[PDB]
Point group: C3
Chain length 535, copies 3
């Protein structure tokens, strides 16, 4: 019966003519560099007569042993966060360069690349050293994959350099960015003694009778707008393949100090749970007589026999078992509060708790919490302490114990986007992109970001206008092209940020609009490597 279901020319899908390729030989080449210092710059010169092509740059980084006292840990993906800039240049000048946060953005979907850059509990959990000669973190090496457009189709897209001298340059962020630390930590010494120790590897190709043809290249150019200004403009846009827009926070009006940090565990729930844990130290107190050692502005109340404390309309159920007879259960009813006028709405972190149950330990003399019912969110965990106690706040603001406040952590991670530590909250309410002075694209919802995430299979997308839907390398990229006489040589982005009540500390986080334009360049090989901005 099958013989029934089975004249004309047909393409063979059961055999292929195995073509003989170019004769080449690859080699993983590692090379130490020159480190020079203001900011730290590593330079790697690649000049070898027998290296014909290269791609897949990996910068390795040896992190020191960290000994002393205080709490200290590394930002996630520390390797990528070390990099402020990378430039690939020849004797004819720059071939390609990228900003560190955009390199991170391009590799943010490479899970293996991310893990190699430094993502472990050994690196990213906040360790604590107890003696001035105690070891906080052990020495370690991380690997940063410098993704470049020369890796896209491997040998085909490789950087050709036969009889050219190419120099890879890495500018490093201040070590302050890649470190999360306590006050007790001697950052002053650390900053002083720490140096970047880098080494650049690449896959080099020795090619016999190489046939060089020109190619095309995309270079992301980044523009940051002014603080709290909701627009940014990219000039000299003649051949752009895509345009991405995102917001980033500006923490310069603060001390960059936050109450809680989860460590290696970076899920939204983890960020929340760590916060709740730090708050719970002061939120529920078991003591003999009214608790001591809180600001006078604190309003710590004894829990009634019903177990319910009413903070305005908010009811909080607190039940601790095995409390000593001489002790009572107290609730800090305004652990953190913010208000801009005396007759305003008030943001009170204690009101975000509904139920706190646990058990007192006679042996260890502390409370062990069992079930916490609350409505703490990712934003609460991302509020700089400074904002709780800003001049705008008519209250004291920070009513924590000094013991709690001491454990606050400085975080200066340079790649934060949004207003929360997970980039969860979307604060762009409307988006308008103008090419010249005409509106090119507008949206009320984040449909450009939905398509971004959808089209790239990523959970970390951005509002992105992609103009190239053409397979890269085998075709000249499709671009939005400029008319210079009509004035269309600029891309202006303007947003309308989403509105919220002025009595939330997060309202006072300063915002910066980031616009990234991918310009098309042509890579030429007449008398060395050279690039040319398509116009």
């Amino acid at each position: 019966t099958i013989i029934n279901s089975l004249s004309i020319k047909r393409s063979n899908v059961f055999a292929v003519d195995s073509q003989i390729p170019t004769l080449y030989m690859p080699q993983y080449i590692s090379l130490s560099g020159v480190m020079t210092n203001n900011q730290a710059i590593a330079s790697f010169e690649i000049r070898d007569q027998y290296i014909t092509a290269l791609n897949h740059l990996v910068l390795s980084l040896e992190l020191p042993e960290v000994k002393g006292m205080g709490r200290f840990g590394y930002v996630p993906y520390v390797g990528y966060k070390c990099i402020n800039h990378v430039s690939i240049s020849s004797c004819n000048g720059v071939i390609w360069e990228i900003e560190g946060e955009e390199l991170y953005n391009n590799c943010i979907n490479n899970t293996i690349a991310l893990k190699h850059s430094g993502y472990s509990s050994e690196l990213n959990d906040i360790s604590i050293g107890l003696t001035p000669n105690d070891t906080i973190k052990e020495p370690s090496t991380v690997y940063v994959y410098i993704k470049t457009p020369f890796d896209v189709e491997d040998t085909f897209s490789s950087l050709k350099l036969s009889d050219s001298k190419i120099t890879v340059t890495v500018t490093f962020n201040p070590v302050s960015d890649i470190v999360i630390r306590d006050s007790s930590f001697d950052f002053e010494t650390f900053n002083k003694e720490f140096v970047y120790v880098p080494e650049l590897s690449f896959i080099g190709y020795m090619v016999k009778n190489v046939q060089i043809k020109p190619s095309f290249i995309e270079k992301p150019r980044r523009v940051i707008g002014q603080i709290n200004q909701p627009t940014a403009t990219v000039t000299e846009v003649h051949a752009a393949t895509s345009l991405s827009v995102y917001t980033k926070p500006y923490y310069g009006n603060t001390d960059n100090k936050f109450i809680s940090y989860p460590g290696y565990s970076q899920d939204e729930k983890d960020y929340i749970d760590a916060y709740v844990s730090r708050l719970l130290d002061d939120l529920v107190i078991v003591s003999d007589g009214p608790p001591t050692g809180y600001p006078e502005s604190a309003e710590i109340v004894e829990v009634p026999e019903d177990g319910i404390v009413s903070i305005q309309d908010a009811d909080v159920y607190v039940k601790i078992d095995n409390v000593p007879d001489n002790m009572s259960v107290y609730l800090h009813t305004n652990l953190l509060m913010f208000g801009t006028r005396k007759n305003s709405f008030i943001y009170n972190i204690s009101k975000k708790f509904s139920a706190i149950t646990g058990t007192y330990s006679d042996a260890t003399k502390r409370t062990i919490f069992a079930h916490i019912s609350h409505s703490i969110n990712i934003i609460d965990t991302s509020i700089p302490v400074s904002l709780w106690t800003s001049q705008r706040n008519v209250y004291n603001g920070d009513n924590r114990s000094a013991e709690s406040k001491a454990k606050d952590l400085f975080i200066n991670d340079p790649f934060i986007k949004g207003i929360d530590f997970k980039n969860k909250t979307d604060i762009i309410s409307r988006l308008e992109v103008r090419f010249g002075n005409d509106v090119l694209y507008s949206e009320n919802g984040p449909i450009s970001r939905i398509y971004n995430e959808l089209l790239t299979k990523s959970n970390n997308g951005t509002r992105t206008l992609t103009f190239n839907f053409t397979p890269k390398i085998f075709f000249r990229p499709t671009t939005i092209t400029a008319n210079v006489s009509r004035g269309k040589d600029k891309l202006s982005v303007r947003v309308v940020y989403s509105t919220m009540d002025v009595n939330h500390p997060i309202y006072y986080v300063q915002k910066q609009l980031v616009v990234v334009c991918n310009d098309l360049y042509k890579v030429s090989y007449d008398q060395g490597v050279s690039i040319t901005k398509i116009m």
Copy 2:
């Protein structure tokens, strides 16, 4: 720097250049994300949204994403959304032109096509904000906050991006979406005012797509696979697909039919959707009634219930079954009781018994003086995913010679209606496989037979999905660039048909799951030709 060992190993042959490419110039186009509001009709009385795409400068399109605004939910009761709510709103999608339907899919088959796309799934609505069962306490309590979800209508026009795009230059395309009843996409208890909710709820859709404006487009015809689904009669282990002339694939699976029930269940895990999560939720709900600490016999259980005091050694023997219960810090005036027949089923008056209490072996915990409740520490049990998937109706069916549901009234109050339209198998995780043998017949000849789900193994293996189906794939030829390889269900030897026969596993007449009715679903992908002569038109290959 390059080792000299390499330099030596490196004349007279033609070689392909593998270090450079000749960049071809592509068709001149410009893409644009276009969104569209639509026309809403509640006559079909189902709700239907229609979107017309007619623009001279839109030459081609692909990647349809339908957005949906979910409202604020205020009131009293427990309420939540099924996971991937957006996909569960869709009962049907049709893409049609002036010459008629070009492509249409059933809502459940769109979902099946998108199950390995985790991003498409997250976008459709998957969060603890959306899918955890929230509770309102006052008639003005907010249960759910308003939200927008985006559902990716995967089409054959997305497969090869611009190449597979639907060309429509000089045609008017209409996308029509039929919506399932909102009852399907909602999980709620009895306290919730669904009657009002259902009345006030409206679907608010908006269709986006990637539009392509092409200069001097050179249009060529292509081919399209259309999934056609057939559902067999209730509890019948056969289904037949007719008019099969050019099938690229054939998929088989089962669905439960809960129409003989109220669709109410004892427990639901919420956002956490792991098999372990479904079980843990169930055990948690039972434990409220399974072990009681009271002064004197517990009260407010049916007279049918058999609550026993736990002996000093901790062991209650329920027939052949032993259950170890030890609760710490019990008051002196109180005792520890075990509900020994929380849920039980039997078909004859003194025969075998399926009794949920007997599936626990160990229960330990500590009584809390402050909260006047027991906190469990470790539960050893043998509850499975099937137990968590039994409609309550079946516990109290006429077929049951016992009372059946001997839980407290308080427990029964927390039961939840679940009407998710895309359930497969007989449990909520589609874990239990009830097909023992599968046969596909074209006429009297067998085309394929299997004892294990090796067709599903190949399915998941070849498509990198952890959620596959028993699938006979006939086309292994690269799509879009080749005409798909198809099987024909003959034409001359009578009718042109594929009939599927399965052998269901045999199950106990005293387990409730026996009475969950099952339906066999067969899905056939027919090959169609998409022609663009004088507008877009399709033709079933025959």
Copy 3:
């Protein structure tokens, strides 16, 4: 409507908006399963594939019926049980072998295939250590697992398929001893299990009925592996004439041990999971609540009563122990040398008890046992991967295993054949320097694992190996780029030298034997003139 600015912004050109749908070869695929012949020393299954209507095949999937396991004791299956059953696979024709792979290399090839791994057996039903209580109690239910025998014939689906038109193909599978795939305690009757156990396999594949097939030759990579002698940091691969890649890794050798370990996490295979199972097993003896000094421990044990202070000092190391709700007639004791190792008396000591910082918990009056709340410790993956044998080694001047007899009874034999490194997660990297010589000249040397970094990076796998990849050319459509021999200059061999990093002679892990593994992928030419044959390229 396209926004107005776009419509304004818009030579030979390639069409990217329609394509010429070509008519492919006329074929018909069929999922074929095949029971085989079973042969026994080693267990061998054979499958012959000869059919008038099967022209080509690819995607071999081996089925495995696991029996019901009834009886008493603790028993479980290694993760990816299906892959761990396979000791060798060979595909051969009347002209001889076409392709063959060792079980561990097939596994390595699929280790980033999450579905293939899941299909082979990765579940709590399979990989959690269940316990049987009655001689007729069910420990494990019957189950089927599916093993994807990835071959070079799957790279490009129909294009790379093995053509067998008018040939008899034989797939042969050699099975490891079932001892390898099972994790069990002493109470389990392995003796009966092993006698009654049989491998029940079935080979499936995708077959193609092809009308007028036009066969052309192809190329194939065959992974050949060389294992070095125990603890030897060199190995050599001879007759290297056209290699596409070269990989190096380490394995432990547990022949000096009974293959018994104190703890196993079960299905939960995260490194933290391994540690928690260990710490959990230790805590049974580590903190004891009894009326008067604990009983039933070796006389060698040093159990001390915990002071009212709560701090017990074991040499420089302090251990804070506080258990709530301890009965009045009972005290809290700390076992201060649960496991200890030393090679000389009055020397350094490796003491597992000194690795705990804090132990808090609460005693249960109802169940007469302690429930631990918080453990501060520094147990690491290595501690969890030490054979019990090594604690009670002749090298040890101490007793070593001062655990209760109850504890020691619960220890589990593990004989998983694909363990890498010296710890159960391959976490510790013990190669400090790597040198590869082609002939006698140095081809590659590295001081960090940059070759592994690149391996993982280029293959999107988090389980890579130090690997020298020579072929960066797309498979199937091109002849693979190879490193080529100069047999004339002696350059027909690949020699690997490592410098293992050394460890403290007072840690038990120093005494775990290690083996160097080298895997060479040789290029062969597949021709189909008068049946299928392969030919080793000798450029």
